[PDB]
RNA sequence: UUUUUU
């Protein structure tokens, strides 16, 4: 086109640690995230809402709360996202007896949850392996091909870094972790 | 009561499907008054449902179109031509174009005639020039952008088609054809560092999902380059938009397999083949 | 490897063409990247020298 | 065991881990500022007459 | 500057006086045995070899 | 005189 061509073209023309506010930010938890990966029997509180809001974007939170039962909402929303994306997640606890009922509760709440300890080795093929940190430190030094599929590593009781004979394990782990693992 | 009546009639004409079609019938009854030449337009809207309402719509249009129904009778004949084959269209186009000589009021009859004619007629001057006149008659609100989009479908100087795709997506936002076509044909063109800017901008105003057409393209754009982290995140967002499209699952599986992951790629490919079991590539990849 | 082809728009496998692999001669006991071959076999999870 | 598992690998040195430890964080916090200050004060010495 | 560097040097010497590390730090067979061991690596591998 | 893991 010659006259139509003109008649159409004339019409066409650093900080690295962000201290998120305790009480203020979240006003719209349901405007975005309308299809939550996990459904509770109650309402998530303010800090649990903020942690979930950052877990959606594949960030790396550092929750520091008082009671252990307020934190496990974050620790199982991360496992619901891991099961939604087909990836894998590692939950690591220091005490051998604490990581048994966690196995029971995570297997009762959803799907497949393997457990690895000094003697137990239930289902080393699931997507929610529960371990003691000395086993993750031992399979980070070799490859172990489980590290190829991780998304989240949920360090459970991170105030054991202060221990005198085991505080070096938490820092060998936090140093040797590759970059694609939140 | 004048301003409200016109708004109600326009809403009835422009409303949703059969339940809203019944709502439109209720609105027409609520505004059962003089100037019945709008009822036929409501009838045309009722034809958008064609279930227990088109027959009433046909009767309502026939009843209303009594004295002249000049625009209404020609438009109704064009609608009948659309329901039938393009035979009636040849008569309607000539009569409407000869009688109502305009560009913007004529643009509605031009779009109806082009929709009837597009079946078989070539129409290099009857409808294509009609769409050109409709593009010269570009209205302020939601009345002539879709015509320009439909005018630039596959041919006729695709470079201005890319320009009026960008304009037809900038003006008309709800549709996810002109924008997708615009970015696709643009990336078909030489320039590459321009598609990414468009996708980033569209993604920013994406509230929660409902932009799968954007997420998917940008994920592929990151997959052609070696940027697997961004590609994986983008494709995960696209699948959260709609977790049934096998193309997304297959492309995400390829993304996982490009970088390390082997059993997560396996899981995604199995899910991709599980639905749409016709695709051989997915089962082979598993 | 005989990799697939993709139609540049609305990708469909036109045909399979052979291309050159690039990350061979990499092994699990001499390279530390996520491109090395997976491993020997099903294997002990931890405690593995070499 | 740490020394053995790092001597074993060739591209990793044991001093990498000591540099990256939390007990070295105060000393090693501003390393990029030290290196840029070094490279930009070496320029300033090139000034004085001989 | 590293506070623990001399202790690393002393550990490497203790390793090399037993037969676990060659000169210039390359792991020997005894080193790879004590590498993949749970606890008391030095004493257990010494008991085994003796 | 409490507590613990490869």
UniProtKB/Swiss-Prot annotation, chain B:
Expression sites (tissue/organ): Widely expressed with the highest levels observed in vascular tissues, lymph node, pituitary, lung and intestine. Not expressed in the liver.
TPR repeats: 34-67, 68-101, 103-140, 141-175, 212-245, 246-279
Record localization: Cytoplasm; Nucleus
Purpose of the protein: Component of the SKI complex, a multiprotein complex that assists the RNA-degrading exosome during the mRNA decay and quality-control pathways. The SKI complex catalyzes mRNA extraction from 80S ribosomal complexes in the 3'-5' direction and channels mRNA to the cytosolic exosome for degradation. SKI-mediated extraction of mRNA from stalled ribosomes allow binding of the Pelota-HBS1L complex and subsequent ribosome disassembly by ABCE1 for ribosome recycling. In the nucleus, the SKI complex associates with transcriptionally active genes in a manner dependent on PAF1 complex (PAF1C).
Pathology noted in the entry: Trichohepatoenteric syndrome 1: A syndrome characterized by intrauterine growth retardation, severe diarrhea in infancy requiring total parenteral nutrition, facial dysmorphism, immunodeficiency, and hair abnormalities, mostly trichorrhexis nodosa. Hepatic involvement contributes to the poor prognosis of affected patients.
Subunit structure: Component of the SKI complex which consists of SKIC2, SKIC3 and SKIC8. Interacts with PAF1.
Family: Belongs to the SKI3 family.
Protein name (database record): Superkiller complex protein 3
Taxonomic path: Eukaryota, Metazoa, Chordata, Craniata, Vertebrata
Residues included from the entire protein: 353 to 638 of 1564
From Swiss-Prot, chain D:
Localization (cell): Nucleus; Cytoplasm
Record-stated family: Belongs to the helicase family. SKI2 subfamily.
Record text on subunit structure and interactions: Component of the SKI complex which consists of SKIC2, SKIC3 and SKIC8. Interacts with HBS1L isoform 2.
Disease listed for this protein: Trichohepatoenteric syndrome 2: A syndrome characterized by intrauterine growth retardation, severe diarrhea in infancy requiring total parenteral nutrition, facial dysmorphism, immunodeficiency, and hair abnormalities, mostly trichorrhexis nodosa. Hepatic involvement contributes to the poor prognosis of affected patients.
Main function: Helicase component of the SKI complex, a multiprotein complex that assists the RNA-degrading exosome during the mRNA decay and quality-control pathways. The SKI complex catalyzes mRNA extraction from 80S ribosomal complexes in the 3'-5' direction and channels mRNA to the cytosolic exosome for degradation. SKI-mediated extraction of mRNA from stalled ribosomes allow binding of the Pelota-HBS1L complex and subsequent ribosome disassembly by ABCE1 for ribosome recycling. In the nucleus, the SKI complex associates with transcriptionally active genes in a manner dependent on PAF1 complex (PAF1C).
UniProt name for this protein: Superkiller complex protein 2
Underlying gene: SKIC2
Residue numbers of the full-length protein present here: 749 to 798 of 1246
């Amino acid at each position: 086109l010659a006259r139509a061509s003109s008649l159409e073209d004339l019409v066409l023309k650093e900080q690295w640690a962000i201290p998120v506010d305790a009480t203020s930010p979240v006003g719209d938890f349901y405007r975005l995230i309308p299809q939550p990966a996990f459904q509770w029997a109650f309402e998530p509180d303010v800090f649990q809402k903020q942690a979930i809001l950052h877990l959606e974007r594949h960030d790396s939170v550092f929750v520091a709360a008082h009671t252990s039962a307020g934190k496990t909402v974050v620790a199982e929303y991360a496992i619901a996202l891991a099961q939604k994306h087909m990836t894998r997640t590692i939950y690591t606890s220091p005490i051998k007896a604490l990581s048994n009922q966690k196995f029971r509760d995570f297997r009762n709440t959803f799907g497949d949850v393997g457990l690895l300890t000094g003697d137990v080795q239930l289902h080393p093929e699931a997507s929610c392996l529960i371990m003691t940190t000395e086993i993750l430190r031992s399979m980070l030094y070799s490859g172990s091909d489980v590290i190829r599929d991780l998304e989240w590593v949920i360090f459970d009781e991170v105030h054991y870094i202060n221990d005198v004979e085991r505080g070096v394990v938490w820092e060998e782990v936090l140093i040797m972790l590759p970059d694609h693992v939140s | 009561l004048h301003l409200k009546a016109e708004a109600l009639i326009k809403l009835s004409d422009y409303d949703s499907s059969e339940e809203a079609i019944r709502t439109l019938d209720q609105i027409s009854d609520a505004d059962n008054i003089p100037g019945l030449l709008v009822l036929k337009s409501l009838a045309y809207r009722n034809k958008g449902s064609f279930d227990e309402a088109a027959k009433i719509m046909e009767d309502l249009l026939s009843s209303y179109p009594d004295l002249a129904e000049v625009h209404a009778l020609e438009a109704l004949i064009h609608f009948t031509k659309k329901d039938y084959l393009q035979a009636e269209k040849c008569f309607q186009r000539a009569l409407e174009k000869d009688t109502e000589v305009a560009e913007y009021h004529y643009q509605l009859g031009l779009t109806y005639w082009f929709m009837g004619e597009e079946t078989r007629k070539d129409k290099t001057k009857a409808l294509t020039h009609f769409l050109k006149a409709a593009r010269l008659d570009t209205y302020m609100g939601k009345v002539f952008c879709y015509l320009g989009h439909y005018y630039r479908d596959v041919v006729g100087d695709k470079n201005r088609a890319r320009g009026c795709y960008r304009k037809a997506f900038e003006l008309d936002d709800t549709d996810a054809e002109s924008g997708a076509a615009a970015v696709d044909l643009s990336v078909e063109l030489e320039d590459m560092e321009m598609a990414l800017a468009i996708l980033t901008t569209v993604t920013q105003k994406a509230s929660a999902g409902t932009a799968k057409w954007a997420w998917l393209r940008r994920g592929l754009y990151y997959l052609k380059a070696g940027q697997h982290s961004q590609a994986v995140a983008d494709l995960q967002a696209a699948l959260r938009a709609d977790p049934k499209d096998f193309n997304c699952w297959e492309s995400l599986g390829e993304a996982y397999l490009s970088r390390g992951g082997y059993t997560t790629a396996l899981k995604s490919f199995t899910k991709a083949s599980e639905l749409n079991p016709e695709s051989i590539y997915s089962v082979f990849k598993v | 490897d005989l990799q697939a082809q993709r139609h540049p728009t609305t990708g469909q496998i036109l045909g399979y063409k052979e291309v050159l692999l690039e990350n061979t001669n990499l092994s699990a006991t001499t390279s530390l990247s996520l491109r090395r071959p997976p491993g020997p076999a099903s294997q002990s999870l931890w405690g593995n020298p070499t | 065991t740490m020394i053995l598992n790092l001597l074993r690998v060739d591209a990793l040195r044991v001093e990498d881990m000591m540099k990256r430890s939390f007990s070295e964080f105060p000393s090693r916090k501003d390393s990029k500022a030290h290196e840029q200050a070094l490279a930009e004060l070496t320029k300033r010495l090139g000034a004085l007459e001989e | 500057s590293l506070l623990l560097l001399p202790e690393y040097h002393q550990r490497v010497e203790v390793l090399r006086t037993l037969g676990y590390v060659d000169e210039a730090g390359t792991v020997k067979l005894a080193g790879r045995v004590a590498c993949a061991m749970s606890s008391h690596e030095l004493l257990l591998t010494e008991l085994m070899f003796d």
